[PDB]
Amino acid sequence: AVGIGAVFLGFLGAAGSTMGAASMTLTVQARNLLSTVWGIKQLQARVLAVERYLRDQQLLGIWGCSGKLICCTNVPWNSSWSNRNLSEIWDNMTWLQWDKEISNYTQIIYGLLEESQNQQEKNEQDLLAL
Amino acid sequence: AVGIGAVFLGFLGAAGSTMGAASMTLTVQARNLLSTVWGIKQLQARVLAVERYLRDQQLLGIWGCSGKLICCTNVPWNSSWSNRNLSEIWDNMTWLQWDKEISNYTQIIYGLLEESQNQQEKNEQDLLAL
Amino acid sequence: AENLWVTVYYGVPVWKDAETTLFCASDHNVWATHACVPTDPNPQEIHLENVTEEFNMWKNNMVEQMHTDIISLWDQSLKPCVKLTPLCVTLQCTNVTNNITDDMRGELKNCSFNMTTELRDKKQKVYSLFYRLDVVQIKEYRLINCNTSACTQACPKVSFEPIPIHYCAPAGFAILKCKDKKFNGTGPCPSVSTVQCTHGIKPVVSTQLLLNGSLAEEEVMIRSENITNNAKNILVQFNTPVQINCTRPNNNTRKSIRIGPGQAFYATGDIIGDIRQAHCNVSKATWNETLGKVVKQLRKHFGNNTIIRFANSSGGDLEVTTHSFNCGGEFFYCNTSGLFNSTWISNSNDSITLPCRIKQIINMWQRIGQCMYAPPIQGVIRCVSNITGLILTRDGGSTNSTTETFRPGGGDMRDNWRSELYKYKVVKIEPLGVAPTRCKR
Amino acid sequence: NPQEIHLENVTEEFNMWKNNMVEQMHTDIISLWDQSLKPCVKLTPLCV
Amino acid sequence: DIQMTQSPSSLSASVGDRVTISCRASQDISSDLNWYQQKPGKPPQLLIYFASNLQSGVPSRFSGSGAGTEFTLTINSLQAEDFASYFCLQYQSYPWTFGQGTMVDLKRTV
Amino acid sequence: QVQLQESGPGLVKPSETLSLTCAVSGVSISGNYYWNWIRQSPGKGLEWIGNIHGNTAATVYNPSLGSRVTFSRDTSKNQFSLRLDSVTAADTAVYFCATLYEFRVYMGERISYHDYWGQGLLVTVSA
Amino acid sequence: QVQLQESGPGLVKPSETLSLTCAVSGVSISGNYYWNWIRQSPGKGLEWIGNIHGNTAATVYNPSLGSRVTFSRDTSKNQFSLRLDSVTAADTAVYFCATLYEFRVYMGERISYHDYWGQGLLVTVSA
Ligand SMILES: *[C@@H]1O[C@H](CO)[C@@H](O[C@@H]2O[C@H](CO)[C@@H](O[C@@H]3O[C@H](CO)[C@@H](O)[C@H](O[C@H]4O[C@H](CO)[C@@H](O)[C@H](O)[C@@H]4O[C@H]4O[C@H](CO)[C@@H](O)[C@H](O)[C@@H]4O)[C@@H]3O)[C@H](O)[C@H]2NC(C)=O)[C@H](O)[C@H]1NC(C)=O
Ligand SMILES: *[C@@H]1O[C@H](CO)[C@@H](O[C@@H]2O[C@H](CO)[C@@H](O[C@@H]3O[C@H](CO)[C@@H](O)[C@H](O)[C@@H]3O)[C@H](O)[C@H]2NC(C)=O)[C@H](O)[C@H]1NC(C)=O
Ligand SMILES: *[C@@H]1O[C@H](CO)[C@@H](O[C@@H]2O[C@H](CO)[C@@H](O[C@@H]3O[C@H](CO)[C@@H](O)[C@H](O)[C@@H]3O)[C@H](O)[C@H]2NC(C)=O)[C@H](O)[C@H]1NC(C)=O
Ligand SMILES: *[C@@H]1O[C@H](CO)[C@@H](O[C@@H]2O[C@H](CO)[C@@H](O)[C@H](O)[C@H]2NC(C)=O)[C@H](O)[C@H]1NC(C)=O
Ligand SMILES: *[C@@H]1O[C@H](CO)[C@@H](O[C@@H]2O[C@H](CO)[C@@H](O)[C@H](O)[C@H]2NC(C)=O)[C@H](O)[C@H]1NC(C)=O
Ligand SMILES: *[C@@H]1O[C@H](CO)[C@@H](O[C@@H]2O[C@H](CO)[C@@H](O)[C@H](O)[C@H]2NC(C)=O)[C@H](O)[C@H]1NC(C)=O
Ligand SMILES: *[C@@H]1O[C@H](CO)[C@@H](O[C@@H]2O[C@H](CO)[C@@H](O)[C@H](O)[C@H]2NC(C)=O)[C@H](O)[C@H]1NC(C)=O
Ligand SMILES: *[C@@H]1O[C@H](CO)[C@@H](O[C@@H]2O[C@H](CO)[C@@H](O)[C@H](O)[C@H]2NC(C)=O)[C@H](O)[C@H]1NC(C)=O
Ligand SMILES: *[C@@H]1O[C@H](CO)[C@@H](O[C@@H]2O[C@H](CO)[C@@H](O)[C@H](O)[C@H]2NC(C)=O)[C@H](O)[C@H]1NC(C)=O
Ligand SMILES: *[C@@H]1O[C@H](CO)[C@@H](O[C@@H]2O[C@H](CO)[C@@H](O)[C@H](O)[C@H]2NC(C)=O)[C@H](O)[C@H]1NC(C)=O
Ligand SMILES: *[C@@H]1O[C@H](CO)[C@@H](O[C@@H]2O[C@H](CO)[C@@H](O)[C@H](O)[C@H]2NC(C)=O)[C@H](O)[C@H]1NC(C)=O
Ligand SMILES: *[C@@H]1O[C@H](CO)[C@@H](O)[C@H](O)[C@H]1NC(C)=O
Ligand SMILES: *[C@@H]1O[C@H](CO)[C@@H](O)[C@H](O)[C@H]1NC(C)=O
Ligand SMILES: *[C@@H]1O[C@H](CO)[C@@H](O)[C@H](O)[C@H]1NC(C)=O
Ligand SMILES: *[C@@H]1O[C@H](CO)[C@@H](O)[C@H](O)[C@H]1NC(C)=O
Ligand SMILES: *[C@@H]1O[C@H](CO)[C@@H](O)[C@H](O)[C@H]1NC(C)=O
Structure with a gap:
């Protein structure tokens, strides 16, 4: 109980775990996204990484989930995308399988999130005018 | 009313529209700000674009409008800056004309926003002290 | 009834196939480690449990990047060195017949010529010893490359010894390694790990035999893109290495001739003592056992009753027809004819000697118009190496006959790199995800 | 118009013999000297 | 300091015999006890951790049981290589304290 | 301008599979468009097969x-x-590949309407 | 595999300072590990000296x-x-440098347990 050290699973080793268990250690993956001709190639790679991080952050911010790791929204879940109940999603599936399953219904969800956030912002502005 | 597609306006199509009409499509412009010697010039241009984006984001955040496209504030509007009322601003004018009109009353508003946000932060900390 | 809502997660552990540019990590040489990041003494590997990946050695992009970097480093190394432009002159050559064996008759030419000097007014007369493979008749000879281009003398300080190098990926990407034994380079790998970057890979250059490589952990492994097609080479990885000892025994001498302001040319002055052929030795019983294992494994894909024949190389240039390598800075080409000569039918201390020829004008890569001159080495040279694989090629393969003949291959150097990077792949992470969940904003 | 700020109550530690600015200055001067001589005549025929 | 007492001090057993050793504490230590083996001229080697879990690679004959202030190490089938000095280590509260040790040697005719 | 061109085998056998391919120029097919297949035969006239998003x-x-x-x-x-x-x-019919869509603004009025009705190809069915 | 190597003077005089150094290879020492110093002597058996984080x-x-x-x-x-x-x-005793720890998952179950118990070094005190 005293005098014993402890070490924990780090990088993507938690990919085989279920979605419920895999969504419990988001920070370990999140923190690793940032950190003559050969110098040009290395600088291009670094600039590409920075640009990708900025694009992801801007996409998160546009939906209203800025500065958050888990941010649940107002858009309802259409049944045409997936008809599996929560019992068979968060305890009998992994993130890779889920991504493979819903790979063809991603852009429409992003557009719906953008429109919902814009509508919420406009409604908030209207409310604050009183 | 089934099976017909729709295509919406592009990047700067709302440049001639009124301020109120053009304020509903801020995302279309916002999303476009991010994306041997020739390689040097291209990398310099990309780094400059990233620097401008980060500067704009920092300026937005310092006013307390982080992660928002429409963020109204607490600073009152001085009549000396502009006398025109809402009827002849949001319905009979465009953004370019407005920029041309108030091009010389910009920095003072920025300073007022900065000091107002600082005062709000100090007051919030004092309130949370209790 | 579901009343579920979209929810966003950042940092989801998923990945996709991608291509990127890796960089150095290493602990005077041609393979410059000065511009290479220093490797961490404590590498970290994360075993991905319940993860089954897909691998394909024949479509890896890391091999092309390694080839390009190796070629670029080789080109960079030779830039600050002397160019042998004045050497294209009319040489007057005679035979060397001072204490020579029967097999070394006519292999050396004693050639005298005129050469420039430091001053732009005077000239000098010099002489050297050249190899029969470097001079072409015009009693008057000329260097073989004079009608193609001008060679650059390799600087005598840089060493050709391979050094291990590790290839590490940028941020936002990851390297997956397959730990499953008996994995034949293609298909689903069920045992996977993530590594920051790879083990030390020595850029060894050779043909017809893989030297100083890595060995299999279970048994001899045979790999091929399409084993039913006779136009594809076969890669064989041994279980245990085979020691090969070999040498150039002539006691060479080096002399410097000043051909200009701060420009020197190194020539072979004279040979002290007897003159004998450079040669290589490989054990006999070990080679027979290795060939037995190889044919036993080959019988799996070509029937249990087929007769398996090992024969000589088909033909072509000297590099693609002989086991070419570099030992002690000297470029050897050995006649591997006594090894692949046997037939196998379904049912002490002597060693095999391979005679070799030394060369000095080298076209290292398959390019025309760019040559290099290797300065001579002083004294006798020997070196011992491990044979740990083969590059075989199936001859013919028609249904008329029930026999298979395999011959040595090589030429392309991408296969040398492919034998080491077969278990590594690169992926890119996608941390954004959307799921159904029971909140409401 | 160079700008300078005076830091009151600040007592720092200095060491002239470990400054890294000297190395950078030396390298820059050598590099500029080498660069300036690139587009000039080479006196190769003068060795007579 | 918690005192760790082992018993018996020394015992003799033959190959295949069942050997039992007891370790007791002055005060309760929950399940924070570990059983180690030590041969002459070699460092201690772990046999049981947390008083009920077998270390990976150790033969299955070794086992541990008990709790509180009473713990037991049992070897079901003693072998030639199992003759050594065995110790119980407690790590619930500082300082760590070891037992005096119990030596197991080959049993032969008198 | 936007153009559509059809291609495929003109003669097919009974009970076999008829494959036609419509290629478009002047606009991408990844946008919000519904690509429709129509056929005209003697007597029946215009007939709608289906569409894809x-x-x-x-x-x-x-x-x-x-x-x-x-x-x-x-x-x-x-x-x-x-x-x-x-x-x-x-x-047996002449097959056309078509698309209909309206160009408008985002929460406002409509600017224009567009339909193209490419040339099409005659296809006959016989062994 | 993690390896621990003890080093230091084999002899020391009474009232002097005894300095030993244990070098670790295979794992970084700056992690969440408690490096322990223990000693064994005839008569006293194993005696835990201390530990450092x-x-x-x-x-x-x-x-x-x-x-x-x-x-x-x-x-x-x-x-x-x-x-x-x-x-x-x-x-006068044989000094051991060791470490005991466990490998688990973040707020979950345990995976494994680790101890190394390096070879140690003999030290004798005498003038
Ligand atoms: C497979 O691996 C094995 C083992 O890893 C390789 O065999 C080793 O090969 C290296 C390189 O040939 C060899 O190291 C040389 O040993 C020589 C004998 O001891 C040394 O004399 C030699 O040093 C000279 O060369 C260096 C550059 O290579 C110079 O930096 C050094 O200063 C020496 O040069 C002086 O001497 C020469 C000659 O007098 C003179 O011209 C110079 O100007 C200078 O004055 C190397 O240290 C190992 O000993 C080999 N090991 C074994 C066990 O045999 C094998 O080559 C690999 N196979 C392949 C195909 O690469
Ligand atoms: C890799 O996958 C295996 C299984 O495919 C994972 O082991 C599984 O772990 C879960 C939870 O730890 C076990 O769930 C249990 O199910 C039984 C069913 O009766 C239930 O009674 C228990 O209360 C518990 O919920 C599951 O049984 C177990 N599978 C097997 C075959 O033992 C393993 O955890 C995965 N690896 C990683 C790193 O996640
Ligand atoms: C480019 O400018 C022209 C005119 O400057 C714009 O046309 C104008 O569009 C507005 C709609 O936004 C019309 O307003 C309407 O006016 C009628 C009559 O006053 C009123 O009953 C309606 O309720 C509405 O307010 C305006 O009449 C019309 N002007 C003209 C001369 O037709 C045009 O929209 C601008 N371009 C874009 C892309 O907006
Ligand atoms: C290569 O030829 C040169 C020139 O003939 C040889 O050098 C001569 O050697 C003889 C006898 O040793 C001397 O008498 C001459 O004075 C040498 N000539 C010069 C210019 O020095 C050389 O020995 C020959 N090398 C071989 C291996 O046969
Ligand atoms: C080095 O140069 C000298 C001078 O040109 C060569 O000697 C001449 O050779 C030519 C033809 O070979 C003769 O026609 C001249 O009569 C020679 N002149 C003298 C003074 O000998 C000499 O042959 C050259 N050396 C070599 C090895 O080619
Ligand atoms: C040739 O192969 C032998 C055997 O694989 C090598 O000897 C091994 O070297 C490794 C070094 O990493 C040691 O860990 C092994 O214990 C050695 N094994 C034996 C049996 O000695 C030898 O180093 C290889 N030679 C070359 C030049 O690579
Ligand atoms: C492996 O190679 C064989 C030989 O080319 C391939 O089979 C041939 O495919 C071509 C395709 O046009 C045919 O013309 C030949 O008649 C085939 N030969 C035989 C013997 O079947 C085979 O497809 C290749 N494997 C893969 C996976 O593509
Ligand atoms: C390769 O094998 C041959 C034998 O086939 C070796 O030749 C012997 O070499 C030794 C050197 O120690 C001499 O003492 C013997 O007189 C040689 N015998 C014969 C018949 O030539 C040769 O040395 C071997 N070379 C290498 C590099 O291993
Ligand atoms: C290659 O060289 C090694 C040593 O360089 C040889 O190993 C020797 O083998 C003989 C067996 O006849 C032993 O008596 C020696 O003690 C060994 N020496 C060493 C240093 O290990 C090996 O036999 C050689 N192999 C061949 C085929 O020539
Ligand atoms: C493989 O062996 C064959 C014969 O065993 C070699 O063919 C010989 O080639 C030489 C060189 O041209 C000729 O002088 C001989 O007359 C050939 N012999 C026969 C029987 O044809 C062949 O050259 C060997 N392979 C290589 C790459 O040398
Ligand atoms: C490689 O070695 C083989 C075997 O020594 C060579 O084949 C011999 O070639 C000579 C020609 O000088 C013939 O007289 C022999 O009869 C051949 N041997 C056999 C067994 O037939 C082969 O020529 C060598 N490779 C090259 C390119 O010369
Ligand atoms: C040199 O020797 C080779 C091989 O014996 C022979 O072919 C050549 O004609 C000789 N040249 C001479 C003697 O000039
Ligand atoms: C140079 O000469 C050799 C031999 O005469 C010949 O094979 C080669 O084709 C020549 N090179 C060129 C570029 O003609
Ligand atoms: C060996 O390679 C073939 C090539 O397609 C592949 O089908 C097979 O699965 C591989 N072997 C194993 C054990 O996966
Ligand atoms: C080569 O010759 C030199 C000079 O005489 C001598 O010192 C050296 O020992 C010789 N090499 C051998 C292997 O005998
Ligand atoms: C090839 O093998 C045959 C026996 O099958 C043998 O007679 C012949 O000498 C061998 N040739 C060489 C070059 O070793």
Whole structure:
């Protein structure tokens, strides 16, 4: 109980775990996204990484989930995308399988999130005018 | 009313529209700000674009409008800056004309926003002290 | 009834196939480690449990990047060195017949010529010893490359010894390694790990035999893109290495001739003592056992009753027809004819000697118009190496006959790199995800 | 118009013999000297 | 300091015999006890951790049981290589304290 | 300008599969467009086969043809293909690939309407 | 595999300072590990001296021996050293440097347990 050290699973080793268990250690993956001709190639790679991080952050911010790791929204879940109940999603599936399953219904969800956030912002502005 | 597609306006199509009409499509412009010697010039241009984006984001955040496209504030509007009322601003004018009109009353508003946000932060900390 | 809502997660552990540019990590040489990041003494590997990946050695992009970097480093190394432009002159050559064996008759030419000097007014007369493979008749000879281009003398300080190098990926990407034994380079790998970057890979250059490589952990492994097609080479990885000892025994001498302001040319002055052929030795019983294992494994894909024949190389240039390598800075080409000569039918201390020829004008890569001159080495040279694989090629393969003949291959150097990077792949992470969940904003 | 700020109550530690600015200055001067001589005549025929 | 007492001090057993050793504490230590083996001229080697879990690679004959202030190490089938000095280590509260040790040697005719 | 061109074998046998491919120029097929397949035969006139949504790959088929109709879309080649299983003598017709869509503003009025109705190709069914 | 190597003088005089250094290879010492110093002598058996924390440099020592010990850690050399002051004849012993820890998942179950128990070094106290 005293005098014993402890070490924990780090990088993507938690990919085989279920979605419920895999969504419990988001920070370990999140923190690793940032950190003559050969110098040009290395600088291009670094600039590409920075640009990708900025694009992801801007996409998160546009939906209203800025500065958050888990941010649940107002858009309802259409049944045409997936008809599996929560019992068979968060305890009998992994993130890779889920991504493979819903790979063809991603852009429409992003557009719906953008429109919902814009509508919420406009409604908030209207409310604050009183 | 089934099976017909729709295509919406592009990047700067709302440049001639009124301020109120053009304020509903801020995302279309916002999303476009991010994306041997020739390689040097291209990398310099990309780094400059990233620097401008980060500067704009920092300026937005310092006013307390982080992660928002429409963020109204607490600073009152001085009549000396502009006398025109809402009827002849949001319905009979465009953004370019407005920029041309108030091009010389910009920095003072920025300073007022900065000091107002600082005062709000100090007051919030004092309130949370209790 | 579901009343579920979209929810966003950042940092989801998923990945996709991608291509990127890796960089150095290493602990005077041609393979410059000065511009290479220093490797961490404590590498970290994360075993991905319940993860089954897909691998394909024949479509890896890391091999092309390694080839390009190796070629670029080789080109960079030779830039600050002397160019042998004045050497294209009319040489007057005679035979060397001072204490020579029967097999070394006519292999050396004693050639005298005129050469420039430091001053732009005077000239000098010099002489050297050249190899029969470097001079072409015009009693008057000329260097073989004079009608193609001008060679650059390799600087005598840089060493050709391979050094291990590790290839590490940028941020936002990851390297997956397959730990499953008996994995034949293609298909689903069920045992996977993530590594920051790879083990030390020595850029060894050779043909017809893989030297100083890595060995299999279970048994001899045979790999091929399409084993039913006779136009594809076969890669064989041994279980245990085979020691090969070999040498150039002539006691060479080096002399410097000043051909200009701060420009020197190194020539072979004279040979002290007897003159004998450079040669290589490989054990006999070990080679027979290795060939037995190889044919036993080959019988799996070509029937249990087929007769398996090992024969000589088909033909072509000297590099693609002989086991070419570099030992002690000297470029050897050995006649591997006594090894692949046997037939196998379904049912002490002597060693095999391979005679070799030394060369000095080298076209290292398959390019025309760019040559290099290797300065001579002083004294006798020997070196011992491990044979740990083969590059075989199936001859013919028609249904008329029930026999298979395999011959040595090589030429392309991408296969040398492919034998080491077969278990590594690169992926890119996608941390954004959307799921159904029971909140409401 | 160079700008300078005076830091009151600040007592720092200095060491002239470990400054890294000297190395950078030396390298820059050598590099500029080498660069300036690139587009000039080479006196190769003068060795007579 | 918690005192760790082992018993018996020394015992003799033959190959295949069942050997039992007891370790007791002055005060309760929950399940924070570990059983180690030590041969002459070699460092201690772990046999049981947390008083009920077998270390990976150790033969299955070794086992541990008990709790509180009473713990037991049992070897079901003693072998030639199992003759050594065995110790119980407690790590619930500082300082760590070891037992005096119990030596197991080959049993032969008198 | 936007143009559409059809391609495929003109003669097909009964009970075999008729494959046609419509290639578009002047606009991408990955946007919010519905690509429709229409056919005209003697007597029957214009008849609608089905349509496919480029962005999502949502397909709708005529109930009359049943499950014999299938659609696919290739974004790399900027094409979309119609597949008709169990073709019979009633399927001899001229096939056109069409698309109808309106260009408007975002929460406002409508600017214009667009339909193209490409040239089409004659297809006959016989062994 | 993690390896621990003890080093130091094999002999020391009474009332002098005894300095030993344990070098670790295969795992970084700056992690969440408690590096422990133990000793074994005839008559007293195994006796735990103390331990030091790699990350926070926190140290705990045996109350019986008191303030006569100081533990240090060097991350650059990947080592940890023990300095025992005022040595006596009773301090002659074989010193072991070790570490005990567990490998688990973040707020979940355990996976494995690890100890190494390096070979150790003999030290004798005499003038
Ligand atoms: C497979 O691996 C094995 C083992 O890893 C390789 O065999 C080793 O090969 C190296 C390189 O040939 C060899 O190291 C040389 O040993 C020589 C004998 O001891 C040394 O004399 C030699 O040093 C000279 O060369 C260096 C550059 O290579 C110079 O930096 C050094 O200063 C020496 O040069 C002086 O001497 C020469 C000659 O007098 C003179 O011209 C110079 O100007 C200078 O004055 C190397 O240290 C190992 O000993 C080999 N090991 C074994 C066990 O045999 C094998 O080559 C690999 N196979 C392949 C195909 O690469
Ligand atoms: C890799 O996958 C295996 C299984 O495919 C994982 O082991 C599984 O772990 C879960 C939870 O730890 C076990 O769930 C249990 O199910 C039983 C069913 O009766 C239930 O009674 C228990 O209360 C518990 O919920 C599951 O049984 C177990 N599978 C097997 C075959 O033992 C393993 O955890 C995965 N690896 C990683 C790193 O996640
Ligand atoms: C480019 O400018 C022209 C005119 O400058 C714009 O046309 C104008 O569009 C507005 C709609 O936003 C019309 O307003 C309407 O006016 C009628 C009559 O006053 C009123 O009953 C309606 O309720 C509405 O307010 C305006 O009449 C019309 N002007 C003209 C001369 O037709 C045009 O919209 C601008 N371009 C874009 C892309 O907006
Ligand atoms: C290569 O030829 C040169 C020139 O003939 C040889 O050098 C001569 O050697 C003889 C006898 O040793 C001397 O008498 C001459 O004075 C040498 N000539 C010069 C210019 O020095 C040389 O020995 C020959 N080398 C071989 C291997 O046969
Ligand atoms: C080095 O140069 C000298 C001078 O040109 C060569 O000697 C001449 O050779 C030519 C033809 O070979 C003769 O026509 C001249 O009569 C020679 N002149 C003298 C003074 O000998 C000499 O042959 C050259 N050396 C070599 C090895 O080619
Ligand atoms: C040739 O192969 C032998 C055997 O694989 C090598 O000897 C091994 O070297 C490794 C070094 O990493 C040691 O860990 C092994 O214990 C050695 N094994 C034996 C049996 O000695 C030898 O180093 C290889 N030679 C070359 C030049 O690579
Ligand atoms: C492996 O190679 C064989 C030989 O080429 C391939 O089979 C041939 O495929 C071509 C395709 O046009 C045919 O013309 C030949 O008649 C085939 N030959 C035989 C013997 O079947 C085979 O497809 C290749 N393997 C893969 C997976 O593509
Ligand atoms: C390769 O094998 C041959 C034998 O086939 C070796 O030749 C012997 O070499 C030794 C050197 O120690 C001499 O003492 C013997 O007189 C040689 N015998 C014969 C018949 O030539 C040769 O040395 C071997 N070379 C290498 C590099 O291993
Ligand atoms: C290659 O060289 C090694 C040593 O360089 C040889 O190993 C020797 O083998 C003989 C067996 O006849 C032993 O008596 C020696 O003690 C060994 N020496 C060493 C240093 O290990 C090996 O036999 C050689 N192999 C061949 C085929 O020539
Ligand atoms: C493989 O062996 C064959 C014969 O065993 C070699 O063919 C010989 O080639 C030489 C060189 O041209 C000729 O002088 C001989 O007359 C050939 N012999 C026969 C029987 O044809 C062949 O050259 C060997 N392979 C290589 C790469 O040398
Ligand atoms: C490689 O070695 C083989 C075997 O020595 C060579 O084949 C011999 O070639 C000579 C020609 O000088 C013939 O007289 C022999 O009869 C051949 N041997 C056999 C067994 O037939 C072969 O020529 C060598 N490779 C090259 C390119 O010369
Ligand atoms: C040199 O020797 C070779 C091989 O014996 C022979 O072919 C050549 O004609 C000789 N040249 C001479 C003697 O000039
Ligand atoms: C140079 O000469 C050799 C031999 O005469 C010949 O094979 C080669 O083709 C020549 N090179 C060129 C570029 O003609
Ligand atoms: C060996 O390679 C073939 C090539 O397609 C592949 O089908 C097979 O699965 C591989 N072997 C194993 C054990 O996966
Ligand atoms: C080569 O010759 C030199 C000079 O005489 C001598 O010192 C050396 O020992 C010789 N090499 C051998 C292997 O005998
Ligand atoms: C090839 O093998 C045959 C026996 O099958 C043998 O007679 C012949 O000498 C060998 N040739 C060489 C070059 O070793």
